[PDB]
Write an enzyme that holds these catalytic residues in place. Structure first.
Site, PDB file in Angstrom:
ATOM      1  N   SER C 141      33.885  56.685  35.600  1.00 38.83           N
ATOM      2  CA  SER C 141      32.489  57.046  35.358  1.00 38.83           C
ATOM      3  C   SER C 141      32.318  58.560  35.295  1.00 38.83           C
ATOM      4  CB  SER C 141      31.599  56.532  36.520  1.00 38.83           C
ATOM      5  OG  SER C 141      30.296  57.018  36.302  1.00 38.83           O
ATOM      6  N   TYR C 154      29.591  55.035  45.383  1.00 30.54           N
ATOM      7  CA  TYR C 154      29.958  54.712  44.015  1.00 30.54           C
ATOM      8  C   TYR C 154      30.842  55.827  43.403  1.00 30.54           C
ATOM      9  CZ  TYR C 154      29.754  53.779  39.055  1.00 30.54           C
ATOM     10  OH  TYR C 154      30.113  53.504  37.749  1.00 30.54           O
TER      11      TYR C 154
END
Ligand code: NA
Ligand code: NA
Ligand code: NA
Ligand code: NA
Ligand code: NA
Ligand code: NA
Ligand code: NA
Ligand code: NA
Lengths: 237, 248, 245, 240
Positions: C141, C154
């Site tokens: 990401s 995350y």
């Protein structure tokens, strides 16, 4: 004092960041060669401040993009103090222009001072540097944030970042450290408000925000760091 | 369907090596290619004949990317020959190594004028003809990651290219022109790995640090150039792709 | 010529979104695709139907990549159905945001177990069948570059994936197995751009290319990395965010 | 003295890097809670070495939420405040991909990651303007050596967590930065062979010692680093 007996050169040191680094180094006991391109009176005031507080300093005029001047700046250190331990390459200039407006002179002026000047001053200094010495290149946070309309300026700083890493490896066996500081916008308008809004620590930078980091890198506290680029921007990257 | 059907590319420094392979690979995907050369006309003519012999379009143009007039003429050649411009690959580059003690003014200027200023001038002339979907690819080098001893000037040029790539990605983003860099590893003559040759101490040292177990050859870079040139890379801008077999 | 003609790929968490588009895109280049899903069988079956109706080969397999037995069955499905394995795409991943004060043991474990241990277990199972020219693609990401507030867990997981990609590139390089990462920006429902939330608006304003990313933006980079076009790239992390970093 | 009146916690401080950081910080005026996972003697030794200054040993396993809270409560109960947190507590284990187990994954991530988040979460209640959090990560996030997937993974997570919390705690003016140490000499043929290989790749020509890290921690703890947050300082003698 972290730099007792040591001798430093700070280029671009009549004002702002350079001036603050010269004073902070002196505060830790370095004798400081205060190089200025522009304003002689600013440099003399830096010297006066250092010497009034019990330090040693000397002002020297010169343009680091010229080989003879770079050499003379280094000679000053040796002829005045007999040794050199720390070089702070801070001589820098900046000008922004979108791609459509970039001229040859815009390119040359910035590369000659921001890049060739770093190389010439460093080349001159390296003759006198030995084990424990520390070279600090003042780069910029633009190498991380690369703003619009900054191709040449950011270009110069990208070059400084790469040179820092090269010389770290090249000079490593001689135990000379080479690091960069990548400052944010430092105040000595729309842009200031914009930058403030992107700055996690909630203010604009000041010269002494950079000075304290240069002292750290100059000192034995950083003896195990070389080739690093410390972003000093209040969290903006 | 060809990824670059109906498109036009310029490749600077394309007489040999990486630039030659990039020109051929872009043509393989349907791009017409202006093959710019600095001084080997014969090399560029070979690249054009190889392109046309394989059914593509290409045209050689000589010029020094560090001279504004030549930068403009290279771009005019695309528009005059083919009517349009979609892809610019700034590959013109020269290299010379020297330790800090041996660096001179000419060593500095020659590399920066070609590897930096030539990128800015060529890009400046091209952008007046680039629209949405256009792709500028700057050929940088893995030296911006590994910064080897005795490369201060060369690596400095490539650090500059990396930062210019980021700037122009942001600056040209609202026009939807993409700007990315490829950072090649050491590249050796095509056929080297098949011939089983380790050519030099430097090759051996880089090979020992290369996870994939050989050195790169020009087509290793070319295939990445086509990727970045195509719509496959439409959501990438400002990236620097290290293409070195895993050395960083 | 189809770039992946005769190759076999696994895509984890491929029932919807990025995973699904990656599966279809690989099969469009001639790969046979094992379409793994964690929950949504119907999503995977429609991915498979989409692939087979376009003339390619695919099979669905349910399983939780964070469980060793399921990771192993996912891989055995490739080998049993198609005889070989060439491409692994580790896309399975979950996300949940929370400020440091609000982080819970379950919020930490669920994300690390799927996003990190799942990638490790699946790669481990796959490597037993990977040989020269194989390509492992980890979906990470853009948060590893921009690290936004309230994403400690995350972003932590994706930072781990970034590092694992670099290790495995060095580790598997002598076997000529490539390992790379894609680091997508925010990706929205396909068709959102053509059609015309405050966070979406914020991220759009910060995106140089002037829209938000859609699954095919990621898929086409995955195909590149899976293919021989990327044969000289390993250990890289490609940010695919429309220029946000 | 740079940390006069300030209080620091250093986790996994009974040996090596953590112990040297604890002595360096107290050398600048900070009262140091010296957390140990096991070696009480080492911790007590560190405290003894400190007592010019103030220090107190405390046992606990930061992966366990109650221990992490008790480490922070020890700071507040003994000295009334908390200014600097050094998340150093670390275990390491190496394995190639074929050899990775659930237990190898969990034990490393629990201490190297969840322990950093738990200790930080406990601490932040007590942190105000000018507080400094220092996460000890590793050069492995740059060099990513083979057979280190889980350990480098933990450190990649710490690097990312550092970036997130720098932005998250920015408005409170709490700084968050990482040190990424190289190999620090603090066994058998395996240790010797590794040491020679790392030396050869280390530009400054020796192996790292614990004080090489300690002095950088003192800089980041201090006001000298007041304009840095979200940074990751590689301290490896030039290896990256
Ligand atoms: Na950036
Ligand atoms: Na940032
Ligand atoms: Na490097
Ligand atoms: Na590397
Ligand atoms: Na960032
Ligand atoms: Na950016
Ligand atoms: Na690396
Ligand atoms: Na390096």
């Amino acid at each position: 004092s972290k730099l007792a007996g040591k001798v430093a050169i700070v280029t671009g040191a009549s004002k702002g960041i350079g001036a603050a680094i010269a004073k902070a180094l002196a505060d830790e006991g370095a004798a400081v060669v205060v190089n200025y391109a522009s304003s002689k009176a600013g440099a003399d005031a830096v010297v006066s401040a250092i010497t009034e507080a019990g330090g040693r300093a000397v002002a020297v005029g010169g343009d680091v993009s010229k080989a003879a001047d770079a050499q003379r700046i280094v000679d000053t250190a040796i002829e005045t103090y007999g040794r050199l331990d720390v070089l702070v390459n801070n001589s820098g200039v900046y000008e922004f222009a979108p791609i459509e407006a970039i001229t040859e002179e815009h390119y040359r002026r910035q590369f000659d001072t921001n890049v060739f000047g770093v190389l010439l001053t460093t080349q001159a200094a390296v003759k006198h540097l030995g084990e424990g010495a520390s070279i600090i290149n003042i780069s910029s946070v633009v190498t991380s944030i690369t703003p619009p309309a900054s191709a040449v300026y950011s270009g110069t700083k990208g070059a400084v970042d790469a040179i820092t890493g090269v010389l770290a490896l090249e000079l490593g066996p001689r135990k000379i450290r080479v690091n960069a500081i990548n400052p944010g916008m430092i105040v000595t308008s729309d842009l200031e408000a914009q930058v403030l809004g992107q700055t996690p620590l909630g203010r604009l930078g000041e010269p002494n925000d950079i000075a304290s980091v240069a002292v750290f890198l100059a000192s034995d506290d950083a003896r195990w760091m070389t080739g690093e680029h410390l972003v000093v921007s209040g969290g903006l990257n």
